[PDB]
């Protein structure tokens, strides 16, 4: 449990991943933590941009279900044999649990170059598992077989590794209070966004623009992804508050010298969320360090920077641009997502996010979700 502290490697750019031991004798793989899907899938054959894969023929305990699954996504896909084997987690657990696994033998645009993970642990709900919700997820297997609570928490520590805590909340990963918001639906970790504000001022938008058709906490998405219309109204407000075009679309990076200190000039971005006691809301904030994102890291007198927010067609995705700011509690048992100020989320001593509350839920619907 406190053994789970610092169990993830990686960053907010290339993803955070967990070591996992699979089969008998154990094969050691690097599995991305992804709260936006629900399958457990690993490389099953050598690939160009991976070092190692799970060989099912060297596992004495592997058994095949005799069918295979394909998962499609916007750019790319992955097909895999569905089977079952024993897994252990070196950081957290003394024993082993019998889980479903998809061994990928064919994919398009799945394993990309300079990526250190060779598989993916979907930690969302049964409903988004392929090929059907009746394929037990890893987290429902572990919860059941290890007698832990139906809660996990995650802390990302690469703004400017991480801890993934399976079966509770570890106090030394946060400071202050945990504020919780309701899970609105159990497929993605869907929550209700009430209000966005840039630099102390609100965007002229209905609260339902934000949750179109869903605001989700996704560890398997790099950026804060906003529906096109929200995206456009955020950009217009950020530009107005300071310095800046292709920079907004992710097709160019703006370079500034050290002393032109870029961060001083952009505004805070605050996301208002409904408290469990509905008359109230709280506010999670990120500052410029998380969303104006240094890309070179060479420690020269300049840096070039990506805008870590991007348009989505129909999804508001609270990915790593925001999650890096907080400790995040996926409390499935109580149907709620917690957020707390994260100690590791400060660049040169300064905190790069904030959390605050409570505020009143007047001036916004009883309910902001379709």
């Amino acid at each position, epitope marked *: 449990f406190l053994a789970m502290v610092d169990n993830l490697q990686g960053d907010s750019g290339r993803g955070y991943y967990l070591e996992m031991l699979i089969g008998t004798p154990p094969q050691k793989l690097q599995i991305l933590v992804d709260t936006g899907s629900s399958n457990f899938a690993v490389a099953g054959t050598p690939h160009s941009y991976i070092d190692t894969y799970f060989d099912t023929e060297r596992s004495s*305990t592997y*058994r095949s*279900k005799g*069918f295979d699954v394909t998962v499609k996504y916007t750019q790319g896909s992955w097909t895999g044999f*569905v089977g*079952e084997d*024993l897994v252990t987690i070196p950081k957290g657990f003394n024993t*082993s*649990f*019998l*889980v*479903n696994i998809a061994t990928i033998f064919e994919s398009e645009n799945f394993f990309l170059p300079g990526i250190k993970w060779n598989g993916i642990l979907g930690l969302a*709900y*049964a409903t988004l*598992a392929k090929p*059907s*919700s*009746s*394929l*037990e*997820t890893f987290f*429902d*297997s572990l919860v*059941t*077989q*290890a*007698n832990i609570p139906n809660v996990f928490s995650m802390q990302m520590c690469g703004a400017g590794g991480g801890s993934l805590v399976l079966g509770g909340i570890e106090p030394s990963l946060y400071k202050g209070d945990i504020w919780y918001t309701p899970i609105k639906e159990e497929w993605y970790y869907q929550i209700e966004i009430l209000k966005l504000e840039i630099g102390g001022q609100s965007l002229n938008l209905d609260c339902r623009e934000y949750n179109a058709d869903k605001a989700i906490v996704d560890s398997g998405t790099t950026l804060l992804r906003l529906p096109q219309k929200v995206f456009d109204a955020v950009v217009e407000a950020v530009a107005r508050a300071s310095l800046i075009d292709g920079f907004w679309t992710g097709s160019q990076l703006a370079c500034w010298t050290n002393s032109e200190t870029p961060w001083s000039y952009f505004p805070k971005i605050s996301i208002y969320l409904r408290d469990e006691n509905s008359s109230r809301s709280f506010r999670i904030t990120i500052l410029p360090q998380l969303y104006i994102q240094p890309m070179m890291g060479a420690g020269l007198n300049y840096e070039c920077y990506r805008f870590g927010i991007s348009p989505s067609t129909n999804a508001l995705v609270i990915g790593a641009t925001v999650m890096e700011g907080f400790y995040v509690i996926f409390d499935r048992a109580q149907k709620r997502v917690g957020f707390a100020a994260s100690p590791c989320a400060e660049i040169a001593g300064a905190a790069v996010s904030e959390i605050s509350g409570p505020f009143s839920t007047e001036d916004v619907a009883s309910n902001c979700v379709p």
Partner: nanobody
Amino acid sequence: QVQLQESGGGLVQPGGSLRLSCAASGFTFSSAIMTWVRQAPGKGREWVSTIGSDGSITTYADSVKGRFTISRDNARNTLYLQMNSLKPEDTAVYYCTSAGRRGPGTQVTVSS
């Protein structure tokens, strides 16, 4: 869509013996992992035993090892738990579970 109904529970004396069944309908049982968990009155949810889809891989809780045997008959959509050498501490509701879903339970009660 996981529907399940356990039965076979009842009242037995220590050293007694029961066979619990769990019947499934509506999902692909012969391709699912299946597990038994029990739950005493105001004690914790306690995992009992898990069986892989074809039956060859079974794992067990220390507390029931050598006493209980999990097994399934895929052709009849049914899971089993052979419960021997029953002692009062085994008293509880036994639930079969798969993919986040469970049956109503079967009451197993061991007393002298």
